[PDB]
Amino acid sequence: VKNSIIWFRKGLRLHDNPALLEACKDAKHVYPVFVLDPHFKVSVNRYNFLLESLEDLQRSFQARGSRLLVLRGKPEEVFPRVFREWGVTQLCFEHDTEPYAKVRDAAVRRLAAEAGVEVVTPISHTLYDTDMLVARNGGAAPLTMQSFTKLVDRVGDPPAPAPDPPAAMPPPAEDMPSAAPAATGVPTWQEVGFKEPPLTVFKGGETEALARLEAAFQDPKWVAGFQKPDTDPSAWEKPATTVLSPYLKFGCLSARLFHARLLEVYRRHPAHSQPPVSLRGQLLWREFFYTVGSTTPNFHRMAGNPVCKQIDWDDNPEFLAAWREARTGFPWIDAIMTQLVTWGWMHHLARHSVACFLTRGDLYVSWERGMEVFEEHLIDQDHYLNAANWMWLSASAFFSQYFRVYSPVVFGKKYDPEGRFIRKFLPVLKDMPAKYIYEPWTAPLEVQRKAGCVVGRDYPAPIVDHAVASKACIARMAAAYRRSK
Ligand SMILES: Cc1cc2nc3c(=O)[nH]c(=O)nc-3n(C[C@H](O)[C@H](O)[C@H](O)COP(=O)(O)OP(=O)(O)OC[C@H]3O[C@@H](n4cnc5c(N)ncnc54)[C@H](O)[C@@H]3O)c2cc1C
Ligand SMILES: [Cl-]
Ligand SMILES: [Cl-]
């Protein structure tokens, strides 16, 4: 008989899950598995988001006669056991192009073959088979968004979302010891070792992802006319973009479903925005960075990375600490960095502000250091997207216009002159008059005292003078660029 495992890593969804559909086909028993390495820096925000995503999967599987098995251990150690215990003949999982995934998945494939297990690994985390895209482009990934968009337009539409799985699923076999409920339940953030609770406002799981998708498409005119660079990074009550990145990162939402819904709207709105600024463009940025990242060695590092300029970043731990701890003395910067740690998500241009500040803009700290801080706190932390955008923002790859430097004072003021965003994430400045809220060190001491926010006592003074720092950084950047002629 056919006993299959559908192994969840990303692709934490029932919809558009060809791995799942295959595992269920003609199956007597299906074991939906997630492998939790229990000795696993990572914020509780992201880890709890994953846990909530597993809980959602548990509910969906229980609604269909099955249940999610959260196995504790390393895959190489767990799968050999359950292959034989469950008499498994087929192992299915969504393909993953991350470096670790290639190593892990190769090891699992070898073990599967030893046990006579058929391995099926469809593509469904990305819009396209990214290796096919590289092959269609003559064997090398495009290195600009312009050429990437021309490639995908020549390739055509991505595959349609896979059908929904059956309303009843073949369950796991009863009395299998490795499937005992007490050993295979979804843990809470407390049980895995976290002491502080999650603070983010975005709940994980496919069910939330689909609801947020529908909310975004409630206004097709907004979807059609979406222009990413025109959106407001200070909007926090109702974020100006979809906030689907956490759900796309974990696969709670299919990118192909997202794309297909976009085309349905675009068909009815002929003036809809186009790439790169359109909502479809945003999925293409993701596809672009996955394609280049997956084919580039050491993509997440500077040294040994062929696409990354070698820059003489300062090893300045005090500057890094100040930025990381939201005490730069620039409320716009510190507010965004507070949003990072509390929500684990910020608007793209808020990420621009803090990343430019840390790297080529002001502090001249390496983008690898900023990426590590983002990697800890972002609930949408994505290996390729985080690396690519950090290289972009530091002018190390893809982007080279290092004379464009965001002001940590003026940038946010264009959107939010009252500083409502600052007042939300930095309550110490709640009473500061708007005239000074972006530059509190310029307020008269009487204003500071009346506002209950004395610079140097309640809120730090700026760690740099932007005018002086940005001029020095641009000088260093120009030098670094001449070095790599
Ligand atoms: C320094 C820095 C770090 C970043 N780190 C991450 C990260 O770890 N994970 C992540 O998903 N994005 C990352 N981004 C990209 C971007 O900031 C987020 O994808 C976006 O802010 C998420 O909001 P949204 O879902 O509302 O995006 P929308 O505008 O609604 O876009 C829809 C989707 O398109 C994709 N997308 C959008 N913008 C980009 C982009 N610039 N690059 C790649 N894909 C994009 C995401 O999957 C996103 O959910 C980073 C950007 C910068 C500058
Ligand atoms: Cl854009
Ligand atoms: Cl600016």
Q: Determination method here? A: X-ray
Q: Tell me, what DSSP letter sits at residue 466?
A: H
User: Would you say 380 is a known binding-site residue?
Assistant: yes
User: Would you say 296 is a known binding-site residue?
Assistant: no
The ligand minimizing its distance to the Cα of 248 is 1
Instruction: Tell the residue nearest (CA) to atom 52 of ligand 1.
Output: 389
The residue among 228, 140, 184, 215 whose CA lies nearest residue 32 is 184
CA of 148 relative to ligand 2 center, distance in Å:
14
* Separation CA 156–CA 148 (nearest Å): 12
45 Cα distance to chain centroid: 13
User: Would you say 394 is a known binding-site residue?
Assistant: no
Q: How many CB atoms lie within 10 A of CB 154?
A: 9
* Separation CA 168–CA 348 (nearest Å): 41
The ligand minimizing its distance to the Cα of 389 is 1
Length of the chain: 485
CA of 164 relative to ligand 2 center, distance in Å:
32
CA of 202 relative to ligand 3 center, distance in Å:
29
Atom number in ligand 1 closest to CA 381: 8
Atom number in ligand 1 closest to CA 283: 34
* Separation CA 273–CA 230 (nearest Å): 12
At 6, the amino acid letter reads I
Name the burial class of residue 416, with classes exposed (0-12), middle (13-18) and buried (19+) by CB atoms within 10 angstroms of its CB.
buried
What residues flank ion ligand 3 with Cβ within 5 A?
Answer: 406-407, 411
* Separation CA 194–CA 349 (nearest Å): 30
User: Would you say 286 is a known binding-site residue?
Assistant: yes
CA of 261 relative to ligand 2 center, distance in Å:
19
CA of 413 relative to ligand 3 center, distance in Å:
9
User: Would you say 56 is a known binding-site residue?
Assistant: no
Instruction: Tell the residue nearest (CA) to atom 21 of ligand 1.
Output: 348
* Separation CA 96–CA 121 (nearest Å): 9
Q: Tell me, what DSSP letter sits at residue 268?
A: H
Q: How many alpha carbons fall within 13 Å on the CB side of residue 338?
A: 20
CA of 236 relative to ligand 1 center, distance in Å:
16
* Separation CA 317–CA 334 (nearest Å): 17
Task: Tell me the best of 213, 339, 348 to mutate to test the pocket of ligand 1, counting ligand atoms within 8 Å of each CB and taking the most.
Answer: 348
Q: Torsion over CA of 100, 101, 103 and 107, rounded to 10 degrees?
A: 140
The ligand minimizing its distance to the Cα of 350 is 1
The tokens for 446 are 């009487």
* Separation CA 475–CA 485 (nearest Å): 16
* Separation CA 36–CA 31 (nearest Å): 15
* Separation CA 408–CA 63 (nearest Å): 50
Please say whether the beta carbons of 66 and 32 come within 8 A: yes
CA distances to 52, 70, 82, 253, 333 from 74, rounded to whole Å, are: 21, 12, 12, 26, 39
Instruction: Tell the residue nearest (CA) to atom 51 of ligand 1.
Output: 389
Q: Which domains does the chain have, with CATH numbers?
A: 1-124 (3.40.50.620), 125-161+206-296 (1.25.40.80), 297-482 (1.10.579.10)
Listing DSSP states for 332-400 in one string gives HHHHHHHHHHHHS---HHHHHHHHHIIIIITT-B-HHHHHHHHHHH-TT--HHHHHHHHHHHTTSSS--
Pocket of ligand 1 (CB under 6 A): 228, 241-245, 248-249, 282-283, 285-286, 289, 347-348, 351-352, 355, 374, 378, 380-382, 385-386, 389-390, 393
Instruction: Tell the residue nearest (CA) to atom 6 of ligand 1.
Output: 386
Instruction: Tell the residue nearest (CA) to atom 4 of ligand 1.
Output: 386
Task: Give the list of residues 6+ apart from residue 332 with CB closer than 8 angstroms, or none.
Answer: 353, 408, 409, 411, 412, 413, 421, 422, 438
* Separation CA 249–CA 53 (nearest Å): 12
Instruction: Tell the residue nearest (CA) to atom 8 of ligand 1.
Output: 381
* Separation CA 269–CA 421 (nearest Å): 33
